[PDB]
């Protein structure tokens, strides 16, 4: 019989999620109940999976396909059948995937690099211009960077977040504007492919209504999880000075020019390890949902019926001691020295299979470029001895994380 947490009469397990930190609560429950537990609400049921041994089965695309969780069904009210909130069987999913994938590879990443540097330089200038004893609000500045970068690299649109105190402000006029601005403009960017690319399979381009949903989808998915990653990784860096020393040394040895080239970002191997170890501990889109395509038995013991939902709790997967060793709470980038050594389906911060994160290379190239520049240009201090406090929205972020940065005075 499947483990299940405490209940609340006819509300079953629902009130367990009446908390501003539901994924953290679910991790505690998984630590209590193990690799799988049932979670019941009035009218619905799901099973939360935490072990590599079960999650590797869940990731078998012949048996399970992406499900839209509760949260995603609400997000679909405004992101529609854009890539993130479409079902795999909806015609617009594979069509858009085919149209947009060439935008997110590599020839593409070289073409985005210069506009990424545009926004990263604005970040570094902001910090160079701080006076003595002022501090940095980390998640806030990371979000200014990530929003501006997806806006510029993807849509040639400047949110100008660094010119603002309060985050950028609606959605329709913005979308309307991004489109109008482009009609009136010559780019080769994400919005280019949205407007002119044809799916080689169907021969069709995206229609107007789905183009609007994709812009909404990318503006959101294109920045919040990346802000969270950069913020957690700066937190782990300031809590682990020897790691910061190694990363800062690599940045100094590698970034020998006033601004980084694409090739130099790729050479930041140890920065790439640090980012993956942050993704291990706090994967910023921490859960994804699947449904059973047909009746099937999980782990030889848990029969599922067609349409049964499962949730992958990624932070708990990333703490599976049978895979990672006993020291899973420790921050050790050396875990990622050779990505080949990581067992299949043990590390899934970008989801799974054909429904995996389309933006993974973009996010990693942005994050590595920016952290490299941060580490080249400043020494950082955890002046408040900050206590990790993780705020949950769609994503995860270290709320109130602040540091001081002292400039190495290296020309930019
Ligand atoms: C440039 C930044 C990013 C962009 C533009 C982006 C975009 C997207 C899109 C459009 C999808 C849906 C893909 C599809 O199903 O066809 C997706 C999926 C996903 N992304 Fe990203 N993403 C970005 C960064 C990130 C980061 C930093 C993380 C995690 C640390 C992340 C984690 C995920 C996960 C876990 C999924 C699968 C979600 C699910 O299965 O329901 N993404 N992303």
Minimal CA–CA distance to 219: which of 15, 389, 82, 381? Answer: 82
Q: Is 13 helix (H, G, I), strand (E, B) or coil?
A: coil
Resolution, expressed in angstroms to one decimal: 1.9
Residues 101, 193: Cα–Cα separation, whole Å? 10
For 44, the enclosing helix (H) or strand (E) is strand 44-49
Please list the residues that pair with 396 across neighbouring strands: 392
Residue 219 contacts residue 229 (beta carbons within 8 Å): no
Minimal CA–CA distance to 82: which of 183, 190, 163, 156? Answer: 190
Q: Is 397 helix (H, G, I), strand (E, B) or coil?
A: strand
Q: Is 39 helix (H, G, I), strand (E, B) or coil?
A: strand
What are the residue ranges spanned by the domains of the chain?
Answer: 1-412
CB atoms near residue 382 (< 10 Å): 16
Could you tell me the fold of the domain covering 1-412?
Answer: Cytochrome p450 (1.10.630)
- Is 357 near ligand 1, meaning CB less than 6 Å away? yes
Q: In what order do the strands lie in the sheet with 44-49?
A: 36-41, 44-49, 309-313, 287-292, 64-66
Residues 13, 49: Cα–Cα separation, whole Å? 16
Q: Whose CA is nearest to atom 39 of ligand 1?
A: 288
Is residue 350 flagged as an active site residue?
Answer: yes
Q: What phi and psi values does residue 8 have, to the nearest 5 degrees?
A: -135, 50
Q: Which of 101, 105, 225 to mutate to test the pocket of ligand 1 (most atoms within 8 A of CB)?
A: 225
CB atoms near residue 330 (< 10 Å): 12
- Is 318 near ligand 1, meaning CB less than 6 Å away? no
Please list the residues that pair with 171 across neighbouring strands: none
Residues 273, 347: Cα–Cα separation, whole Å? 13
Alpha-helical regions (H) of 129-261:
138-155, 171-183, 190-196, 208-221, 224-239, 241-254
- Is 372 near ligand 1, meaning CB less than 6 Å away? no
How far is Cα of residue 128 from the mean position of the Cα atoms in its chain? 28
Give per-residue burial for 228-260: e unless 16+ CB within 10 Å, then b.
Answer: bbbbbbbbbbbebeebbebbbebbeebbeeebb
CA distances from 354 to 65, 81, 94, 177, 304 (A): 9, 16, 9, 32, 23
**Would you give the DSSP letter of residue 184?**
T
3-state secondary structure 261-329: CHHHHHCCHHHHHHHHHHHHHCCCCCEEEEEECCCEEECCCEEECCCCEEEEEHHHHCCCHHHHCCCCC
Exposed / middle / buried, residue 88 (Cβ in 10 Å: 0-12, 13-18, 19+)? middle
Q: Whose CA is nearest to atom 12 of ligand 1?
A: 84
Minimal CA–CA distance to 287: which of 88, 60, 58, 81? Answer: 58
């Amino acid at each position: 019989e499947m483990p299940q947490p405490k209940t609340f009469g006819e509300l079953k397990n629902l009130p367990l999620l009446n908390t501003d930190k539901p994924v953290q609560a679910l991790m505690k429950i998984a630590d209590e109940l193990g690799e799988i537990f049932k979670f019941e609400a009035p009218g619905r049921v799901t099973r939360y999976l935490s072990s590599q041994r079960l999650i590797k089965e869940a990731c078998d695309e012949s048996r399970f396909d992406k499900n839209l969780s509760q949260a995603l069904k609400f997000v679909r009210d405004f992101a529609g059948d854009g890539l993130f909130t479409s079902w795999t069987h909806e015609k617009n999913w594979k069509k858009a995937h085919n149209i947009l994938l060439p935008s997110f590879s590599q020839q593409a990443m070289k073409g985005y690099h210069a506009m990424m540097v545009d926004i990263a330089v604005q970040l570094v200038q902001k910090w160079e211009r701080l006076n003595a004893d002022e501090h940095i609000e980390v998640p806030e500045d990371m979000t200014r960077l990530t929003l501006d970068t997806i806006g510029l690299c993807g849509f040639n649109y400047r949110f100008n977040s660094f010119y603002r105190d309060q985050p950028h402000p609606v959605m329709n006029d913005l979308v309307d504007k991004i489109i109008a601005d482009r009609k009136a403009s010559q780019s080769d960017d994400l919005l280019t492919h949205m407007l002119h690319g044809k799916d080689p399979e169907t021969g069709e381009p995206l229609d107007d209504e789905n183009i609007r949903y994709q812009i909404v989808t990318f503006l959101i998915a294109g920045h919040e999880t990346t802000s969270g990653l950069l913020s957690f990784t700066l937190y782990f860096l300031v809590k682990n000075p020897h790691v910061l020393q190694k990363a800062a040394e690599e940045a100094a040895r590698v970034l020998v020019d006033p601004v980084p080239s694409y090739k130099q970002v790729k050479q930041l191997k140890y920065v790439g390890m640090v980012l993956n170890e942050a993704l291990r501990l706090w994967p910023t889109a921490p859960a994804f949902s699947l449904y059973a395509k047909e009746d099937t038995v999980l782990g030889g013991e848990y029969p599922l019926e067609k349409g049964d939902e499962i949730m992958v709790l990624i932070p708990q997967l990333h703490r599976d001691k049978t895979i990672w060793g006993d020291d899973v709470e420790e921050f050790r980038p050396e875990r990622f020295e050779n990505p080949s050594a990581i067992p299949q389906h043990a590390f899934k911060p970008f989801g799974n299979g054909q429904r995996a994160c389309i933006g993974q290379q973009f996010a990693l190239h942005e994050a590595t470029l920016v952290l490299g520049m941060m580490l080249k240009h400043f020494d950082f201090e955890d002046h408040t001895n900050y206590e990790l406090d993780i705020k949950e929205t769609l994503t995860l972020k270290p709320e109130g994380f602040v540091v001081k940065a002292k400039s190495k005075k290296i020309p930019l």
